[model samples]
Target: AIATINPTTGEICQRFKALTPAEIDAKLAKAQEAFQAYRRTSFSQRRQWLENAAAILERDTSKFAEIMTTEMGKTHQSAIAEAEKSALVCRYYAEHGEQFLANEYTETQATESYVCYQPLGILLAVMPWNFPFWQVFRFAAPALMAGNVAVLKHASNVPQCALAVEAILEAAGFPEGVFQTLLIGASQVEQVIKDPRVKAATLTGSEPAGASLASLAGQEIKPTLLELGGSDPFVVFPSADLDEAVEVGTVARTMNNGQSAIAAKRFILHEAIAAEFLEKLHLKFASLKIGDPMAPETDIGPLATEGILQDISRQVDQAVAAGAKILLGGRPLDRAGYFYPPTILTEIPPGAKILQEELFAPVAMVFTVKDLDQAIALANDIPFGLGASAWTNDPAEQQRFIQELDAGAVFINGMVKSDPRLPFGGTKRSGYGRELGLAGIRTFVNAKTVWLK
Candidate 1:
């Protein structure tokens, strides 16, 4: 049985039995059947359904936000923001999917030739607990609007949230089998991915989980989109507004209690101002309110699972042992439910585990660079090149960082974030393909080329 253990209090809310193989087959078959009819739907007809989903979300934002925080431990306000963001995407694609998927006219060969984007079929989505609704909606909104049916295999810990997602769509008047959630464990994902009905797959999770999904999809010759691990850099130069950079940097690093793949894990500062920045960061980190996620006033909450807290703690211990300086709050809080205080580490050793691994907690690692070249080198040094934020006012330095940074998304004067209108994804070990915007709606579609005499 899979169970949801509230990260806020470590209390078990409910339990669900794993879906039987026969049960999984029935849902996949239903999705397959649904696609046949769903793909025939006019763009406007589909838009209404998606718009309805967004309305349901808007009306029940607080209700959904509560489930999100209870299962995953993000603060109440942030969780509400996530639900709002997810709703925005649903409405965004409802209006944009038609135009984004419109035919591309070509000048080659015949006078009336163009490339067409058509839906594939049923797709499998393996999503994580963090930003539960946001991650699922980012992919589902586009895929469904593009005429593909979706089957979600959410993280075992967020089963209620998963069920709620399907329920919201149903309440929005989506036809039966148009969107379904499978209450299954990690062990069951392989079979679902390999099933012939599942035309393609998308995942947003850790490196290992993304890799595993990619491998299975590859074996079956199915397409896959992955938004995997990221240890993003928060680079601050002397030219930047120190006050704004430090304040925004703290929020960027601590967002979702630092479980986000786009969370700024590495604080790269110029040597000239590194000391001052560190001092400010120390004071900022020490002031965060760590408590239950349900509280409206809490700034930081517990990690999603006990294992996540333990893993983050192990890395901190390893980094300290390897000569990294603990600037503030290096230990877990005395409270229960996987709570870890906002922590900071400076003068991180070159070979420290914290430098090499993605710190999925409220821990920040600091590094100082002498020049732009060194800063770029350290930012792009990691195996994962997902998202990055660099602070500088000089035009020359801004251009240099923007052009040289190896990340998929870069924020020059602001912190990194994902928007419904922009494409979001990464390169190298950070996974493949894109999500959101025009490019995202096509990730799982068939872009057929046509030519005539």
Candidate 2:
């Protein structure tokens, strides 16, 4: 049995009995059977179920969000937002999935030719604890709409959220085995993926986890989508509106208590405006309220666990040791929970640990660049490239960022975020395959070419 403990109080939250081999076989059998029936469902029917699911999410938003907070220590407000965002994604696919999968006609062929979308059988979703509801919904809503049955292997830290997902689908009238949560050890994931009953898999988590999953899936010849770690650059040019940049940048870097994949990690600011930007940013970071996440006044909460806290501390210590100036927080709190102050660092040497690695915490590293050319170079210096943001009023600079920044999504004058209507993924080591939007629904479907002679 896997046990869940509340990070905030170190209290035992719940225990989930691991699925025995026999139970797993039964679940797989049911999932395969369910997929046979579900794949035959009409687009309109899938649409109705998706809409119902969205409604259910909205109705139970508070309860579900609370469960997420207790499971992973995210702020209550952010947790609620995550649930609502998941609902939005469900509705988005409901409204657009059919059109996206509609048969495409080819005129060049001698006879009538078209492409038909067919569902793959059982699929596995390896999900992370951060933004528990959002991560699963991003995969499940589209996969289900595409007529694929999902077996979720959620992170052990968020068992309650995992159970809630199955419950939500059931309450929305989904058939048995349409969505099942497997309580299994992480080491056992490869065995499940290797099972012939599983056709494909998707994951959203750390780099090492993504590498391990992708390598295993590759060996089995099963396709997989990986959304890994990122050290997204947040660049601010001298032309930017300083006030807006400071306000939005603080929130962007501190999002999810600074544990988000796309949260701005590197601050590449124009040398002309770097001092002013740092002053405002430091003040804003200092003003942030830190307390219980459930409390309305708390702006910063504890790290998800002691392990994460230790990781962040080590990163900070290493960076400081490497001659980086710690302008703000540089240590953990001497209180209950894995709390750390909002931290900012500057004057970091090139190739520093913080510059090359993802801190995954409320630590923002600042870099001063002479011009846009230098900014883009610094932004692209790292191996990770999930998202990037640039603050500039100059059209030329904006074009440069859009054209040269090595990221899946680029935000100008605002914080980078994943939207239900847009495709979200990354290039290079950050992973492949898009999620959200029409492209997301097509990920698990087979595009069969059809011709009428």
Candidate 3:
């Protein structure tokens, strides 16, 4: 059901009907029609509209925040921050997109040679429930700036938030059909992708979802960008600041109720500091307030859905059954909501199947390694290469981690995060294509070559 069932109480707040075939077709046609005029809009004109979007986001921050929190169960404070940060992406692209997409000249034997970026037609964005606002803007800001229109097939649970985004863009002065949210179910996406009007597609969700869209898009001869799952590692060395690592790592894992794609799920620690670190980490995890998402005092909220809560619980149960020990928070809270406390799993036996899976909850897996080689090897052992965070005061160790970590982005002394200024994506099964920075603007554009002789 495409409905808003409050994760905090599991109450069906509202419901929306899935779009009919005729409705979906009409939206597709509108998007294709809008792109004909939108693609010809000048850079300065696009920049103004995006700047207006940023302004609208900032002005109506609380209004948008309420919609996001009510739908997905992120803390109201975090939801407000997400709204404000969405504005940041808008402004970032507005300020830099023109230069980023400008033609590049080459000194050739002929009179002139250059590569120019041009917009594709309608693009489909298949986004997830977690970080709903930020994820969409991360794609929309750049896509719109590059003169492409978009249609969103957002997660079924966050229907209101999905529609709120389309309304936001519309309010910001975009053409009526420039950005529309299709109130559709998962099965309906195949028809949208099969439509010849959708030039390319991008998805930010689970591996199964990404695989399905990518496969369907591929068969249709359409390009795809997938920002899938990650089991990002947070490593700590002897020379690292233990207190800082404990503080940052706690937020890294527990933020978004631990549903983030780049959240630090694995902790690879130097054996010498492992005990001390775990002790501090245990104290820190115990201190988090798990309750109402609307309350400013609450540090963790319910899992976004009952299925998410069940999945995380089952994974932890399996790990324990497979010989892993829980330092804290081994099970779901006995409460009315889909609440699970912050958990720490340690003493994981070697060759455990759970090691290879991505735990999309506020659960941390701790491992101790004796040397740098072992640390790097263990970190790179997983099939995921999305993001990794390492802590070390020694410059050499920091450099080594930065150079050797098999991930998309490596932060030497901090937690993993997505920034508008950096190219963010994965190398292996975590999916392909890049987002943010200049690479983001270039992702859906046709880089055409021009030569004169």
| Candidate maximizing lDDT | 3
Write candidate 3's Cα lDDT for 1-453 as tens digits: 999999999899999999999999999999999999999899998999999999999999888988888898999999999999999989999999999999999998979899999998899999999999999999999999999999999999999989889988998889989999999988999999999899999999998999999999999999999999999999999999999999999999999999998999999999999999999999999999999989999999899999999999998999999999999998999898889999999999999888999999899999999999999999999988999999999989989999999999999888887888888999798889999999999999999999999
- Compared with the true structure, what per-residue lDDT tens digits does model 2 show for residues 165-227? 999989888888899999887887877788899999999998888888889989999889999
TM-score for each candidate, following the candidate numbering: 0.98, 0.98, 0.99
For model 3, where is the 10-residue window of minimal lDDT? 413-422
RMSD, one per candidate, in order: 1.0, 1.1, 0.9
How far off is residue 128 in model 1, in Å?
Answer: 0.7
lDDT, candidate 2, residue 445?
Answer: 84
The Cα local distance difference test for each model comes to: 0.91, 0.90, 0.94
Clashes of each: 0, 0, 0
Query: Alpha carbon lDDT of residue 67, candidate 3?
Result: 89
Worst 10 residues of 2 by lDDT: 1-10
TM-score attained by model 1: 0.98
Question: Where is the poorest 10-residue window by lDDT in model 1?
Answer: 347-356
- Please identify which of the two predictions, 2 or 3, would achieve the higher TM-score against the true structure: 3
